[PDB]
């Protein structure tokens, strides 16, 4: 944004948006799977209590 | 498709395909995780039966 103006910059910003949004979606998906595993472990812990 | 012909339209259709396919893949992934949780709950319900 210091070096390019809108018509040019948007193409580059869109490449960053696409890759950063894919990075965030990957993080959230794997946190959802880890949460499901921690949920199973807490169910087991509550059953042992 | 009313406003652009193939060579121009394909770039815009591909933008929509990319984002809609990512939307539907996000939906399917989170349904897979929810289904795993509902199966853990059905396993528990069957065990309580």
Swiss-Prot record, chains A, B:
Function: Subunit of the fusion protein that is processed upon entry into the host cell. Mediates fusion of the virion and cellular membranes by functioning as a class I viral fusion protein. Contains a viral fusion peptide that is unmasked after S2 cleavage. This cleavage can occur at the cell membrane by host TMPRSS2 or during endocytosis by host CSTL. In either case, this triggers an extensive and irreversible conformational change that leads to fusion of the viral envelope with the cellular cytoplasmic membrane, releasing viral genomic RNA into the host cell cytoplasm.
UniProt protein name: Spike protein S2'
């Amino acid at each position: 944004l210091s070096r390019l103006d809108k018509v040019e910059a948007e193409v580059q910003i869109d490449r960053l948006i696409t890759g950063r949004l894919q990075s965030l979606q990957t993080y959230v998906t794997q946190q959802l799977i880890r949460a499901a595993e921690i949920r199973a472990s807490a169910n087991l812990a509550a059953t042992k209590m």
